[PDB]
Subunit: 200 residues, 2 copies
């Protein structure tokens, strides 16, 4: 039993039962091993969630650092876009990420992210709030997305015809578009707000 | 007899006691001293209860869906965001409850006037829709994040601040001492500012 086997098995389990269903007990049972053997790999549900989130961001290369020559705008754009995929990678992927924080091992990454932004002329405070603005919007979009998927299968489906015109057009927009353009537009609002902030 | 009014008040109280994961129509029946069939009429299942809960929450905290006479659209969206946030914070797991809702038919008039108001300011319907959704998901995400992080720190060892590098240390300091509101108001302002440019 190696860590990577635990995590891969845990991710399949997350798909099977979702975040609320997930327990070390079930992961032990899935792995075909005893409780105490698993414990050294993951001591409790929280550690299990932490490791799952590390794996998802790692596997889908969430873009925490700028590439050479990348503007700060493109950087934030790619942080959001890649984080979005990573969270979408798995059932309740956003809920699993929601509670994480930088590990010690990622402190250098975390510091480079802030240094990069402060080198553009942002104060530290603004660089933080910029980072969180994008994280929060991205977590929120996908939490909204993943929850509505589930809520849809649990209530009457609404009639287009009962809806007033502007509401009905907005319903239509979303089926014409899917979720991607709404997310891109929100993301641009933040960048453009950030651009004004950076002038001041 | 059981009126819908008591069902939802009891439900709001139960939500505070056991949170969203412990909420079931069964426990709600039990708390009311009624059988599951008697409750069925008011609330068919868990989803309908969550939906009835979110409407009530946003109603009693007077979430700002409609403009005050003369209010700019910037202020409208600011009051929408802030008031929404108020309602989510006023109830245990309020944002989780709110997360999976949509407009009901009773709210269609509100919902339509909201879009009508934004289009009269010169936003296309498309932009009006995305504007509101942007504000809504940013708000939901800000509260859900902040809640989850406090729960999480309880379930984890506590990191030594001094083991953090400088800039990250300062970011942590700002967060612990300022609370959650400044990040929220800052992100809200980036969105308004982005929306100004679009128009």
């Amino acid at each position: 039993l190696d860590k990577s086997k635990v995590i891969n098995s845990a991710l399949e389990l997350l798909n099977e039962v979702g975040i609320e269903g997930l327990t070390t007990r079930k992961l032990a049972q899935k792995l075909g091993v005893e409780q105490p053997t698993l414990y050294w790999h993951v001591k409790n549900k929280r550690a299990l969630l932490d490791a799952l989130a590390i794996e998802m961001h790692d596997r889908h290369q969430t873009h925490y650092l700028p590439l050479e020559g990348e503007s700060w705008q493109d950087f934030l754009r790619n942080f959001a876009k890649s984080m979005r995929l990573a969270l979408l990678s798995h059932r309740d992927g956003a809920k699993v990420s929601l509670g994480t924080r930088w590990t010690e091992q990622q402190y250098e990454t975390a510091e480079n992210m802030l240094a990069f932004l402060t080198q553009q002329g942002f104060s530290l405070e603004n660089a933080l709030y910029a980072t969180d603005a994008v994280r929060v919007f991205t977590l929120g979009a996908v939490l909204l997305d993943q929850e509505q998927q589930v809520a849809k299968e649990e209530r009457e489906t609404p009639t287009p015809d009962s809806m007033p015109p502007l509401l009905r057009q907005a319903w239509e927009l979303k089926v014409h578009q899917g979720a991607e353009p709404a997310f891109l537009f929100g993301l641009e609002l933040i960048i453009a707000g950030l651009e004004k902030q950076l002038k001041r």
